[PDB]
Structures are given as C-alpha cells and as structure tokens.
Ligand binder design. Structure first.
Ligand SMILES: C=C(C)[C@]12C[C@@H](C)[C@@]34O[C@](Cc5ccccc5)(O[C@@H]1[C@@H]3C=C(COC(=O)Cc1ccc(O)c(OC)c1)C[C@]1(O)C(=O)C(C)=C[C@@H]41)O2
Ligand SMILES: C=C(C)[C@]12C[C@@H](C)[C@@]34O[C@](Cc5ccccc5)(O[C@@H]1[C@@H]3C=C(COC(=O)Cc1ccc(O)c(OC)c1)C[C@]1(O)C(=O)C(C)=C[C@@H]41)O2
Ligand SMILES: CCCCCCCCCCCCCCCC(=O)O[C@H](COC(=O)CCCCCC)COP(=O)(O)OCCN
Ligand SMILES: CNC[C@H](O)[C@H](O)[C@H](O)[C@H](O)CO
Lengths: 536, 142, 70
C-alpha cells in the first residue's frame, strides 16, 4: 500500500476495482483485504486547484462512483468481510455524497448516477431497514440533498425531489406519491421534508443564499415542488407583507424628505425647540428619521453576521444590503455631527436622502416586468463602470497634467479646473472657445482636439456598446431572475415575521405511507400538487 | 532644451501625455482588462482611418463653399470655418443666425444640409461600425 | 530551447495572417508551458516592471509640473 504524501492509503483493492477486474476483487476480498481502507492522499482529496480523482476514499465509494454495481453488491453482501453501507470518509462524505460530487449535469452522467443512487438506496433499505442514509450529514453539515442543491446538480435534485418507487419493501423511500391521474391532469403528493423546515440547512436556503457561482442557481427553482411552494407561499401570506413593507418605506421617505427640506438655517446646531406647531412636527420627523436609520443599521449588521460573505463576493451578491447599510451609515454620521455642533451634518444628511430614494428600486425586484431595471443598473455599475474607470482615468490624468504643464497663468493652470473642464468635454458639454491670448496655442488646440476625438467619440461609444451588449445579454433572462428574487424575499420574510408564529407549513401532517419497515406509520407533511401535461 | 528654445515645452508635453496612455499596454494579459486596449487598437487602426477620408471630403467641401459664399465676417477664413463645422459634427455648434449678411437663405440651407449629413447621418454610421467592431471581438477575449 | 527557431517564437511573432494563430496556443503542452512559466517566475517580473513604469511616470509628471517659467 502506498505510503507517500501523494497516494497515501491506496491499496490493491482500489486498483482491482479501478481496473474493473471482478476476479481480482473477489480474490482480494476472499484473502482478507480491507474493504474500508481510506486512500486520502493529495491525489485523492476533493480539490479544484490540482488534478486528482476524488471518489470518497473508500472501495465501496469507488465502486459506486465508477458504475460497477456487481462489485457493490459483492462488497455489501459477501460474508468474508461485509462492507458498511454507511461508512464515511475524512470529509464525512458517504457513498451518496460521493455520488453527488461526481455529477456534471449531462444526460448520460445523470442516467448513471441516478440509477446507482436508486439501486444503492433499495439495497440499503433491504440490508438495514432501520438505517436512514439520506439523513447522514457530512463534515459541513450537508445531507446529500443539501449538497446537491448547493453544488447546482440539477439532475440529481430533479430526481430526488420527484422520486417514486412502485415496489413494496422500499416504497417508504419514495418522495412523490401519485394519488390519481385523469387524461391530462394528475394529482400527487410531495414529501416536503427538509425543503422548508429542517432547522439546520434547508434546500431553499441553500439555493437562495448560494454564492452566484452555482451553475444552475436559477434553473433549480423551476423544479416542480419548489416552484409550487414558492407560488403558494407568495399568494398565501408573503405578498401582503411585502406590499405593507413597501408602503411603510414610502411613508418613511416622505417623512424624511419633509423633515430634511425644512431644516433650520441658523448657525451652530443643535437647535432648541420653540413652543410652536412647526417645531413639534419637525422634531417628530427628525426622531422618526433617525429611528429608521438605526433600524436599518442593525438589520445590516445582523445580515452580515449571519451570512459571513467573503470579500471577493461581498458586492457580487448582497449589493442591496450594502446600499441600505451605507444609507444607515450616512444617517448616523449625520447624527454624530449634529450633536457635535457642526454644520457639516447637512452634507451627510443630504447623501443619505439621495440614497434613500434610489434604494426604492430594491422594491421593484420581484415584479416580472420591473425588476430588470434594478438588475441592469447593478450589473452595469459593478462590471462596466468599475472596469472602465481605470482606462478613462488614465486618459483624463494624462491629458490633464499635460495641459496644466503647458499652460502658465490662466483658468487652465490648476489640476482641479482643468480636470473638470476635460470631463465636461468628454460628456459633450464643453465650449472649445479658443479666444484667449496665450503662448503655444497651436499645441494646446492639437491636444484638446485629440482629447475630444479620443474620449468623446471613441471611448464613450466603446462604453456604450459594452453596456448595450450587457443589457441584451439579460433581456432574455428576466423570467428566471424574477423568480430568484422572489425566493429570496420569501425566505427573508419568513425569518423575521414579527408575530412569534412559524406557520411555514403548507398542508397537513398527513400519513404518507402508513407502513414503515417497523409497525409504525409515517406522517410527513406532504404537499399536494395537481399537475397538467398535454403530452399525447 | 539645450539649443535654447522654449519650444521644447511643446515636445515634452506630448511625451508626457503619451506616457500615461501607454500604461494601457500593461492591461494586456489580464483576462478582464486587456480587451479595452485591443478595442482601442482596432478602432484607431481600422475605423477612424477609413472614416477619415469620407469625413474630410464632406468637411472640406462644405467648408470651402461657406468661405466662398461669405465675405467680410467671422466665416471668412478656412481656419474658423473648419473649426466651426467640425464643432457642428460633434454636436456642440450653435447655428446662431445673428449676422447681417448676403445670401442669408442659401447660407441657412447649406448649414442645415451639413448638419443633417454629418451629425445625424455620418456620425451614427461610424458609431454603428464601431459597435460592430466592439461586439465582434468580445467573444475572442479568451 | 531550440537555439535556432522554436515553436513559441514562431507562433508569437507571426504576422497575424496565420489562420489559427489563436488556437495553436490551446494545444495542451503549450498551454501548460505558458501557464507554468507565468506562475513560476514571469508574473512577478511583469508586475515589477509595471510598478517601475508607474514610478517613472510619477517622477516625470512631478518634474514637468514644476518647470521654471523664465
Ligand atoms: C456603495 C456603492 C457601490 C455606491 C453608493 C453610492 C455612492 C452610489 O454610487 C456608487 C458609485 C457611483 C457613483 C456615481 C455614479 C455611478 C456610480 O454606486 C453605489 C451607489 C449607486 C446608486 C445607483 O444605483 C441604483 O440604481 C440604486 C439601486 C439599484 C439596484 C438595487 O437593487 C438597489 O437596491 C438597494 C438600489 C445610488 C447611490 O447610492 C446614490 O444615491 C448616490 C448619491 C450615489 C450612488 O457607490
Ligand atoms: C502613432 C500613432 C498611430 C498615434 C500616436 C498619437 C498621436 C496618438 O494618436 C494617433 C492618431 C489619433 C489622434 C487623435 C485621435 C485619434 C487618433 O493614434 C496613435 C496615438 C493613440 C493614442 C490612443 O491609443 C491608446 O489608447 C494608447 C494605447 C492603446 C493600446 C495599446 O496596446 C497601447 O500600448 C502602448 C497604447 C494615444 C496617443 O499616442 C496620445 O497620447 C496622443 C497625444 C495622441 C495619441 O497617432
Ligand atoms: C473624425 C476624424 C477626423 C477629424 C479631423 C479633425 C479636423 C478638425 C479640424 C479643426 C481645425 C481647426 C483649426 C483651428 C483654427 C484656429 O483656431 O486658428 C489657428 C490657430 O493655430 C492652430 O491651432 C494651428 C491649427 C491646429 C491644427 C488642427 C489639426 C490658426 O491661427 P489663428 O489663431 O491666427 O487663426 C485665425 C482665425 N481666428
Ligand atoms: C445645447 N448646447 C450645448 C449643450 O450644452 C450640449 O453640450 C450639447 O447640446 C450636446 O452635446 C448635444 O446634445
């Protein structure tokens, strides 16, 4: 057996299974080879930045991952040394986790992995009827379903959530339960366990709070039980709460604007109240405004502590939370400057006020029609302008310092004024009024016209072509983006909910099968779906 | 500089200007950023070089027509008239007919014709071609 | 290492009319070689060159800004 730091733990049984030699496997198991050896070398670990073969480190996992069912049945059933179906690796991944890891969302891989998963579950039920493999979590606390949801494996997820077995002695492993069928319509029940209420890590939490790299982040919500769940939750209670929140935010911004507009103009804050109506209403509005700022501040901190987003994806996701938090920061800095007796609180207040209105666009998310504008603004700012700033500032600074150096004595003799005027030229509102008497006028004109041609004509339209391409990229994807935002809203409304109830269930705690492997019956919170399909 | 001519300032400044924009050379080799340097290269070498002849034909034709028509005014030198019609091309002229002058009707017709031909028609033709060139090389970015 | 005329020199210094100038670098040993050389020692040298050019331009700008006006 290999003893190095690269192939640590690899042994002959792995080579026999890997080579697909039934005879050598039978002989090795006969001679007392260890059927639960851990090949955990760096070649065998789960990793992206190094070539390797991760299979779950175990011969049973290797057999399952390589599409060799006969060897699996041999290892599990053979009496020389039977293999434990529920063994786990150093990552804690069992055979089912290993099977999830080797998916790649292709047709043939889906067929292989779905088949092997189904067969292993049936065999596991037969060998250990009291064993529940699907509830075993790996080291990260993920069940195989949660791992599939996080990884974006659409095929495995679609199979599991719509799983049905028409066979006694393993029917309790089904999740989809067809109750009837008519011509185009059929009514079925869906198991729903650990979709909504798992208390540790549900499927919807995993899909919603994924890190935007997941290959099928938005297609996963089209899988039928999830889509029906989100539609039911939306229509049932969440929609009203969302509209109420939007209305309350509108009232808050109206009060804030009215209070801000009527600030006193006298020097040296803070200002003392006179026994007059306008002062009472103004101070009331101020208190409400600062209250709203403090509320959004603590909501922002709670979000960041709960999610723990990384710096690399801090802005790629969580754009809206960052903007609401920055609004809160400007409000608090304004309060600090206010009671510190400085006029400069006006400056801080003003920025928050401006932000307060544009954050209203957050509420157009979740509309099929309107959310595309918020999404387009986000992507344009985060990609195109942030990349383009380096190029444009190189041009601006180059010609700016050139012109400042050339010119002595005038309005174009300081960095500030010349940078502002060159920026004006770039957005097409300059003057070009070459009417001043100064030396080197020809070179000045050549520089300025070169700048105009380079930035106004060329670079600006380069930027516009790129932004237009970005918009046409996501003209098509509106339907999925809408659903994903709706899902995030539904979960966020579920979490707080401000009533002490957690009525997050759909249909009754119905008896699903009634016939466990033991004499008990299973009640499982099934959810009814009446589907229609006009095929044939 | 050593020849005792203050005109060295002129040469220095051009180098200084070029010195900054050549930093775009270092964006090349970044997967995200190098596309901008490439797009600028292709646009300057292809599109402006080809478009320049067309636009200079239009500019010089209408400019010399205006200078011939006008006598005794601001628009009585090639310099100012070329500057003004170029300003009209990029949408920052003013068409202020506030001079007392002869053949005013024909002058107005010429300026309107030039404005339509260069601002509306030619400039958007160029911008369409540049957009084609920019979108053509996005997918080659890898 | 050819000492006369290597493959990478021929591909890199081609005249831009070569039909598959872009795809020829995707051939596997070449792609791995360029990735390896980049990550090994070239990347740091390139960043150092860029840093030095930045310092050069800042010195040039500061010197030119403060020219005498006599
Ligand atoms: C934190 C960031 C990234 C940000 C905060 C401020 C300064 C911001 O400018 C930017 C930088 C900027 C400034 C000026 C022009 C373009 C970009 O982008 C946003 C930020 C960007 C915007 C514009 O973006 C929007 O359309 C708001 C918005 C879009 C999509 C949403 O989902 C959303 O939900 C909250 C909000 C609004 C400002 O916050 C604002 O009102 C002011 C005064 C400046 C805008 O900085
Ligand atoms: C030698 C040529 C071909 C060139 C030299 C000068 C005059 C240039 O204008 C041009 C002609 C020109 C002038 C004005 C508007 C458009 C085009 O294009 C370049 C040349 C073009 C540019 C603009 O191109 C750039 O973005 C720089 C650049 C792009 C891509 C790169 O790979 C790169 O690597 C070094 C540099 C910069 C200037 O050199 C400059 O700073 C000044 C003052 C004029 C620009 O003449
Ligand atoms: C779209 C791609 C193709 C675009 C092609 C661009 C064509 C733009 C033509 C604009 C030319 C404008 C020249 C400015 C005239 C001027 O303003 O007058 C000049 C000032 O001198 C100069 O700057 C030298 C000429 C400048 C060199 C310029 C390339 C002569 O002297 P005067 O001041 O006494 O003129 C006495 C009259 N008041
Ligand atoms: C309207 N007088 C000039 C404007 O200030 C502005 O600079 C110009 O019109 C735009 O470039 C054309 O839309």
């Amino acid at each position: 057996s290999y003893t190095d730091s690269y192939y640590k733990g690899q042994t002959a049984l792995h080579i026999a299974i890997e080579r697909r030699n039934m005879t050598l496997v039978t002989l090795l198991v006969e001679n007392g080879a260890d059927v639960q050896a851990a090949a955990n070398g760096d070649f065998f670990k789960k990793t992206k930045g190094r070539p390797g073969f991760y299979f779950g480190e175990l011969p049973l996992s290797l057999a399952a991952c390589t599409n060799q069912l006969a060897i699996v049945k041999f290892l599990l059933q053979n009496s020389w040394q039977p293999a434990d179906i529920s063994a786990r690796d150093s990552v804690g991944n069992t055979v089912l986790h290993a099977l999830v890891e080797v998916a790649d969302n292709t047709v043939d891989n889906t067929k292989f992995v779905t088949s092997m998963y189904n067969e292993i579950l049936i065999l596991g039920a037969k060998l250990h009827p009291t064993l529940k493999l699907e509830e075993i979590t790996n080291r990260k606390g993920l069940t195989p379903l949660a791992l599939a949801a996080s990884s974006g494996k659409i095929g495995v997820l679609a199979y599991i959530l719509q799983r049905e077995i028409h066979e006694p002695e393993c029917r309790h492993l089904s999740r989809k339960f067809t109750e009837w069928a008519y011509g185009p319509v059929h009514s079925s029940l869906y198991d729903l366990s650990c979709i909504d209420t798992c208390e540790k890590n549900s499927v919807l939490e995993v899909i919603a709070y994924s890190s935007s790299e997941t290959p099928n982040r938005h297609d996963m919500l089209l899988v039928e039980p999830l889509n029906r769940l989100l539609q039911d939750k939306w229509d049932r209670f969440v929609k009203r709460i969302f509209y109420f929140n939007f209305f309350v935010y509108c009232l808050y911004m109206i009060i804030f604007t009215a209070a801000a507009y009527y600030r006193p103009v006298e020097g040296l804050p803070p200002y003392k109240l006179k026994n007059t109506v306008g002062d009472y209403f103004r101070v009331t509005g101020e208190i409400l405004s600062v209250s709203g700022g403090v509320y959004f501040f603590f909501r922002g901190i709670q979000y960041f502590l709960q999610r723990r987003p990384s710096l690399k994806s801090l802005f790629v996701d969580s754009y809206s939370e960052i903007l609401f938090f920055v609004q809160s920061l400007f409000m608090l800095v304004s309060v600090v400057l206010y009671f510190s007796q400085r006029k400069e609180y006006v400056a801080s207040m003003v920025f928050s006020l401006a932000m307060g209105w544009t954050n209203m666009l957050y509420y157009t998310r979740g509309f099929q029609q309107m959310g595309i504008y918020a999404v387009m603004i986000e992507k344009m700012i985060l990609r195109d302008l942030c990349r383009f700033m380096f190029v444009y500032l190189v041009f601006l600074f180059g010609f700016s310092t050139a012109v400042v150096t050339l010119i002595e004595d005038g309005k174009y003799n300081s960095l500030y004024s010349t940078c502002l005027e060159l920026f004006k030229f770039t957005i097409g509102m300059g003057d070009l009024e070459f009417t001043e008497n100064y030396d080197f006028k020809a070179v000045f004109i050549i520089l300025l016209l070169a700048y105009v041609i380079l930035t106004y004509i060329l670079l600006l339209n380069m930027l516009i072509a790129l932004m237009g391409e970005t918009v046409n990229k996501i003209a098509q994807e509106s339907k999925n983006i809408w659903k994903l935002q709706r899902a995030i809203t539904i979960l966020d409304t579920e979490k707080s909910f401000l009533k002490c109830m957690r009525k997050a269930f759909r249909s009754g705690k119905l008896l699903q099968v009634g016939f466990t492997p033991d004499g008990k019956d299973d009640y499982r919170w099934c959810f009814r779906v009446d589907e229609v399909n006009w095929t044939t």
